[PDB]
Amino acid sequence: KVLIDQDLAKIREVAAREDLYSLLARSIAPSIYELEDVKKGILLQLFGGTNKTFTKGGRYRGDINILLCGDPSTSKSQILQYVHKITPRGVYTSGKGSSAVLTAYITRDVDTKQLVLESGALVLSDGGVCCIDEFDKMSDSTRSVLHEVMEQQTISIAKAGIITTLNARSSILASANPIGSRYNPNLPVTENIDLPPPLLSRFDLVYLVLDKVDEKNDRELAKHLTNLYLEDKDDVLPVEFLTMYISYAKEHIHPIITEAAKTELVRAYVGMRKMGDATTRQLESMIRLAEAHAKMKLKNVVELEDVQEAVRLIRSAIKDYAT
Amino acid sequence: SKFSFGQATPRTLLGIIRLSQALAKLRLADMVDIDDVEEALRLVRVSKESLYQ
Amino acid sequence: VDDVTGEKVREAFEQFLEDFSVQSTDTGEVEKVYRAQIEFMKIYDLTIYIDYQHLSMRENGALAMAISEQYYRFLPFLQKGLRRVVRKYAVHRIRDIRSEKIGSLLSISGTVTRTSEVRPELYKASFTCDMCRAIVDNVEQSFKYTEPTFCPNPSCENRAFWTLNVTRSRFLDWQKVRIQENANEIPTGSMPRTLDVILRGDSVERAKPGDRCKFTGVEIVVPDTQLGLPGVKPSSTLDTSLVRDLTYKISFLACHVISIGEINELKEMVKDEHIYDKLVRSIAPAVFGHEAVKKGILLQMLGGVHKSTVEGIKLRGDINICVVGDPSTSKSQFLKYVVGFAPRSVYTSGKASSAAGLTGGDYTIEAGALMLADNGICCIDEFDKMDISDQVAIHEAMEQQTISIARTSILAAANPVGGRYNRKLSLRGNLNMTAPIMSRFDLFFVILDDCNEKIDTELASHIVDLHMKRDEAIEPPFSAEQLRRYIKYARTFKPILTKEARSYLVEKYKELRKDDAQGFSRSYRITVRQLESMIRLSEAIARANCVDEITPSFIAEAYDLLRQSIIRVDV
Amino acid sequence: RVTLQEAPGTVPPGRLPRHREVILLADLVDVSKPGEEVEVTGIYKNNYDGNFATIIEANSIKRRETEEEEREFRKISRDRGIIDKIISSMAPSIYGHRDIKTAVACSLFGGVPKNVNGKHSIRGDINVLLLGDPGTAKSQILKYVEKTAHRAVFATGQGASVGLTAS
Amino acid sequence: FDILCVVRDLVDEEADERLATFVVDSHVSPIPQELLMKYIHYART
């Protein structure tokens, strides 16, 4: 079959490295040499937020959900499967093979000849990150159940068999493809994606993968992929240091968001609100992303710094919404 | 939206490498050469856009 | 042997229960808690409620580690000792089950599935032969339907047999449910496991499918597709022509099953006067902004009168509030607080649900997220994602208050067409609904925001300070539990309006229609329903004020409520 | 013997109904009919032994809602002004609208098809259409119709129910 | 269809007055409903 601690100082050695923000993210996926912000967001997906429950009410988890999409020839599916490999309890689903009844796997028994109610795929995602493919190609029942997860993070079972709800938290991450084969400019982002706009802005961060007409990126692309294809296979590449670092940092790190950050928060928030014709949704995004970075590098407090790139990560997407 | 497609995936290159690999298998000698891959490119440029006549 | 061990355990436990039960002083219970339990039982005439710790208190576990191994061995001793007391005075899982666990005590939690019916039992076989003295009563009751005893002492023999008397006995009822294992403990790639459990006697019907419960520690095995299993199957060839064979399985039995998983304060809350205004700011502290929506919510919390009439038609007592607002306003938080606080609440932005979602001979029609909100608010978001037949069903539930083949109030959350409201355009071109469902709605609550650094920073500062775990303990003037206690006492008012201002309400309705008779440019052909809703609104405001015999001032308040409610629509 | 199952109307919402046995005797032979509700007065027994199921034997079936009673009735029915009084006694909730209320009162009161001896039958019903307006309690009237009249099943707006076509 | 009863909606001040006042009466000579039910059942048979 196999219900023949000490490494922490090395963890603190790497934790004391100044270039941790590039060494840790760069060592994640050596297949793509770009999307450093996306890789940082993926890193923060496991360090996502502070599960803050209030005295009465509140009960605000640290869940964040980011979808990436765009043009092909990016090997996005291999990226998502790699995320599925990083997740210790990863669930990799796809499109058009689901229904509302990823949840409610109720079926009939064979040997006892009864009807036994079973848990779905998202119940297997209870704690961790889920993976979904072709998010634009869901059914009517599928993708509509997600409102409960994005808002209440619950599941409502109420038929003749069992009338009982339960929660199943995860990190939903998916990908899909747009209508046009090439994403054209001077066109709305909500238009060129087959997503419902209330759910579209409900997501944490939206990415865009575009095709480039360069030659330099195609040369490093083809030399990189030729080396990956050849022989059928100066950087430190920790395969499992980060894996145990996240598990250790999940319970032993509690980032606090005190007073000094609120000054900068309101200071950045007025300039953010200046663009109009920005809602509180973006404010909750920045406060859950700043403390997410604060969970990284073993910081139990918030800092006035790490907030500038935390806001800028959202602003990079926003500057992509000009057209 | 002409006869030619928009983008070229890296799987196209993965396929043409495996194709030239099989072309080397038909030589039965492990003598991967310039014409070995040239034949692999020939069946790609000829496979597609054969609608000229 | 076992009689002596069980008799010593029996006498020591009888002395134990006859001793102190709880160590607590006069402040609280002093002693004889189980004796007061039996006296409490004399008041109710049901059972026993025993703690594992209280049995573990006297012998320091010596008696507890006597019972916790062979309880099945010690059932009649435990009943006889309690019987003599009567005449004297008047957590693990399914994986933790082994064969050594028979007779012992182990607590198991899980998931209830497939409840069963009620069926009586027996355990009182009064079966004797054709001989005159046919009045025996077998003291057997085991897991065997062997009614007639062999050796009676009449002239009849063992072969002389007759039926069991089904009229001179004591039975009990019971059900048999099959519990499922939790999904939060099963590993990946693993299907759920099943296990049977038997619910015996008085604690019947306490089950509910889909629940976490704690069980009695005892366990049994019931005598018996388990043929050619394989295994050495025993036979009953006794030592000396050719009985049956057998292959059993682990079962479960229980006797105690729990299903886990102030007048002065109300006087303080009713003798005051500012309590209405206190209830204004004490609703949604998480929300930082306006408050009139909380007014309509508070009035929705108190029911109407719904009084009877002659046998033809009785009047209903409910209110219907529907609020439409600007996108990206954290409106789901508003909804979430509504469903988070109000009882009998089901939240749904129903689009994934079937057509029945909005609503040998099983005939079970499902519940539907709408029908199951009896005496509750069913709040639904994104009306544009649903069709028109659903809107018709809305009118069905809102008029007949029945569905023939729902006693609910519905809360709405809608959105603009262009995302924003065009002020040069009318309000009717922005609700995206038909005329009768709009007219069925009582209140609208149009909310639209602008940009201003003062209001944005003050509300943002309040909400961020809520996320600040420091100072997140902002205090409403009332707590949530004294407020709910106040609502429970408040629904018990039943106001009888006996005021002459009913006529003032009538000319008030006339002037409510004459001004609405003017200016049909910007959006209403005011409905009779608006007037009847005005009646019930004036009822519930005074209900919120703990005032019977509604004053004309309250009439004027409800009037100005609907007046500016429609002027906010009138632009 | 009649099988009886629980009524879908007073089911706690979401749970499932259960069954129980009812046996008929002499004057009550085949009184119910599929698609009904019922209220029975039963004595409760159980089986003797099998090699306990309970059986309900029933006495008085009443469905869920004299000489001087029809002659004192005829002492009043002899008057003349019962025409306007019927509409005045039809539906006191909404006060006016005597014409449409008299037409509805006439509808449930019935017509006669009058089959000719051997030849042919014409038609025996009165057809009522009432073009509404949102903003009307016209539905309250038909609810009065359903409670006072004999057999009435409310046919829904669109497919939500029964379906009027046997299949 | 046989009969077509049609109601009308026009601004009448007194009809609204009577309507609101009888509604108040509704929240406060004709045949009682038990006799009319014996009337239609005994008549149609």
Swiss-Prot record, chain A:
<feature type="domain" description="MCM">
    <location>
        <begin position="20"/>
        <end position="226"/>
    </location>
</feature>
<comment type="function">
    <text>Acts as a component of the MCM2-7 complex (MCM complex) which is the putative replicative helicase essential for 'once per cell cycle' DNA replication initiation and elongation in eukaryotic cells. The active ATPase sites in the MCM2-7 ring are formed through the interaction surfaces of two neighboring subunits such that a critical structure of a conserved arginine finger motif is provided in trans relative to the ATP-binding site of the Walker A box of the adjacent subunit. The six ATPase active sites, however, are likely to contribute differentially to the complex helicase activity.</text>
</comment>
<comment type="similarity">
    <text>Belongs to the MCM family.</text>
</comment>
<comment type="subunit">
    <text>Component of the MCM2-7 complex. The complex forms a toroidal hexameric ring with the proposed subunit order MCM2-MCM6-MCM4-MCM7-MCM3-MCM5; loaded onto DNA, forms a head-head double hexamer.</text>
</comment>
<protein>
    <recommendedName>
        <fullName>DNA replication licensing factor MCM4</fullName>
    </recommendedName>
</protein>
<feature type="short sequence motif" description="Arginine finger">
    <location>
        <begin position="201"/>
        <end position="204"/>
    </location>
</feature>
<feature type="binding site">
    <location>
        <begin position="70"/>
        <end position="77"/>
    </location>
    <ligand>
        <name>ATP</name>
    </ligand>
</feature>
UniProtKB/Swiss-Prot annotation, chain B:
<comment type="similarity">
    <text>Belongs to the MCM family.</text>
</comment>
<comment type="function">
    <text>Acts as a component of the MCM2-7 complex (MCM complex) which is the putative replicative helicase essential for 'once per cell cycle' DNA replication initiation and elongation in eukaryotic cells. Core component of CDC45-MCM-GINS (CMG) helicase, the molecular machine that unwinds template DNA during replication, and around which the replisome is built.</text>
</comment>
<protein>
    <recommendedName>
        <fullName>DNA replication licensing factor MCM7</fullName>
    </recommendedName>
</protein>
<comment type="subunit">
    <text>Component of the MCM2-7 complex. The complex forms a toroidal hexameric ring with the proposed subunit order MCM2-MCM6-MCM4-MCM7-MCM3-MCM5; loaded onto DNA, forms a head-head double hexamer. Interacts with CSM1 and MCM10.</text>
</comment>
<feature type="binding site">
    <location>
        <position position="11"/>
    </location>
    <ligand>
        <name>ATP 2</name>
    </ligand>
</feature>
From Swiss-Prot, chain C:
<dbReference type="GO" id="GO:0031298">
    <property type="term" value="C:replication fork protection complex"/>
</dbReference>
<feature type="modified residue" description="Phosphoserine">
    <location>
        <position position="190"/>
    </location>
</feature>
<feature type="modified residue" description="Phosphothreonine">
    <location>
        <position position="498"/>
    </location>
</feature>
<dbReference type="GO" id="GO:0003688">
    <property type="term" value="F:DNA replication origin binding"/>
</dbReference>
<dbReference type="GO" id="GO:0043596">
    <property type="term" value="C:nuclear replication fork"/>
</dbReference>
<keyword id="KW-0238">DNA-binding</keyword>
<keyword id="KW-0378">Hydrolase</keyword>
<keyword id="KW-0131">Cell cycle</keyword>
<protein>
    <recommendedName>
        <fullName>DNA replication licensing factor MCM6</fullName>
        <ecNumber>3.6.4.12</ecNumber>
    </recommendedName>
</protein>
<dbReference type="GO" id="GO:0006260">
    <property type="term" value="P:DNA replication"/>
</dbReference>
<comment type="similarity">
    <text>Belongs to the MCM family.</text>
</comment>
<keyword id="KW-0347">Helicase</keyword>
<dbReference type="GO" id="GO:0000727">
    <property type="term" value="P:double-strand break repair via break-induced replication"/>
</dbReference>
<dbReference type="GO" id="GO:0071162">
    <property type="term" value="C:CMG complex"/>
</dbReference>
<comment type="subunit">
    <text>Component of the MCM2-7 complex. The complex forms a toroidal hexameric ring with the proposed subunit order MCM2-MCM6-MCM4-MCM7-MCM3-MCM5; loaded onto DNA, forms a head-head double hexamer. Interacts with MCM10.</text>
</comment>
